Design a protein around this ligand. Structure first.
Ligand code: HEM
Ligand SMILES: [Ca+2]
Ligand SMILES: [Ca+2]
Length: 319
């Protein structure tokens, strides 16, 4: 099909996304940048979708975190999410798509602005949300590995899928974990969707980048990075450490698994066969240029190797 302005897409119903795409790129992502608004919109896709529990309810990726923001933004795990909900609400009011489609569309378009990124499959047609998420369904950084895996498993993700979705922390920073140092990233390349997050969480911790006593924070290996305790533990737990290390210097696997697992997450509470595939509307992301590395000056002796089956790969660092 050819839309009214000449852009093409496989299914005609997808044409309504083009003006939305142009508005988001200009007015939500500040001229299609891979910056904080993209990182915030990707976090929002997960805080919207993971409100899904077979025993308690919630409609998953349904827009409830916007539609019922008065409730869901009161949950402590949603602290800080109100800013991006407020930013997106007027786009949903202006355009003619549901809040659940909007949140997944904006996260997929955002990720396409990041070098190394992928086009997350995107389906159009989710109905408006009909219930708020139950409380207590979003994992937090002070939760044990067993607790996070049980919650993600309950929503339908295996432990290796947890690891694959946490590639999102390659384009991520924290404002709440240590409020003295807002905007401190989880890896050294928060505008590049790469394997640095999986490498740098494996380093021995050295210091706290801000204050020392924050709940859910581990020591970081570098002054300009922050480390969640949940990431510290998942990189070292026998349930997940082998998969974590397998992502290092493995950009094809990061891309293939993040796209597929993001799509499964974007579809929680929905049925793909009732929606319209509009994947080809998402922009084509830039590719990576630089190789994966340890931080300069670090060596394999600074890595806490946690996979008994396979040694950590011998990457270069300091030239
Ligand atoms: C599985 C357990 C997870 C835990 C415990 C967790 C925890 C957190 C925490 C504590 C923050 C920082 C919030 C702040 O203080 O500002 C954060 C940020 C973020 N999270 Fe995760 N997360 C998890 C999974 C995910 C998943 C599956 C996604 C996929 C979309 C995601 C995407 C993000 C993004 C992109 C940010 C950066 C937000 C920004 O820079 O503005 N997280 N996460
Ligand atoms: Ca939801
Ligand atoms: Ca990165």
């Amino acid at each position: 099909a050819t839309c009214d302005d000449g852009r093409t897409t496989a299914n005609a119903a997808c044409c309504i996304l083009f003006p939305i795409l142009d508005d988001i790129q200009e007015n939500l992502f500040d001229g299609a940048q891979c910056g904080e608004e993209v990182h915030e919109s990707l976090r929002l896709t997960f805080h919207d979708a993971i409100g899904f529990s077979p025993t308690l309810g919630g409609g998953g990726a349904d827009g409830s975190i916007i539609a019922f923001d008065t409730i869901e933004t009161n949950f402590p795990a949603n602290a800080g999410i109100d800013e991006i909900v407020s930013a997106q609400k007027p786009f949903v009011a202006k355009h003619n798509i549901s809040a659940g489609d909007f949140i997944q569309f904006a996260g997929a378009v955002g990720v396409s602005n990041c070098p190394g990124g992928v086009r997350i499959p995107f389906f159009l047609g989710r109905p408006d949300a009909v219930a708020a998420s139950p409380d207590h369904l979003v994992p937090g950084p002070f939760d044990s590995v067993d607790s996070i895996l049980a919650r993600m498993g309950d929503a339908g993700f295996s432990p290796v899928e947890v690891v694959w979705l946490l590639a999102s922390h390659s384009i991520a920073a924290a404002d709440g974990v240590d409020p003295s140092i807002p905007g401190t990233p989880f890896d050294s390349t928060p505008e590049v969707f790469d394997s640095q997050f999986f490498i740098e969480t494996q380093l021995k911790g050295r210091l706290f980048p801000g204050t020392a006593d924050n709940k859910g924070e581990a020591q970081s290996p570098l002054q300009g990075e922050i480390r969640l305790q949940s990431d510290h533990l998942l990189a070292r737990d026998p349930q997940t450490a082998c998969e974590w290390q397998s992502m290092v210097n493995n950009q094809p696997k990061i891309q293939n698994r993040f796209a597929a697992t993001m799509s499964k997450m974007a579809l929680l509470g929905q049925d793909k066969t009732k929606l319209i595939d509009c994947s080809d509307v998402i922009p084509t992301p830039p590719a990576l240029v630089g190789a994966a590395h340890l931080p300069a000056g670090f060596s394999l002796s600074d890595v806490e190797q946690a996979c008994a089956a396979t040694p950590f790969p011998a990457l270069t660092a300091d030239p």
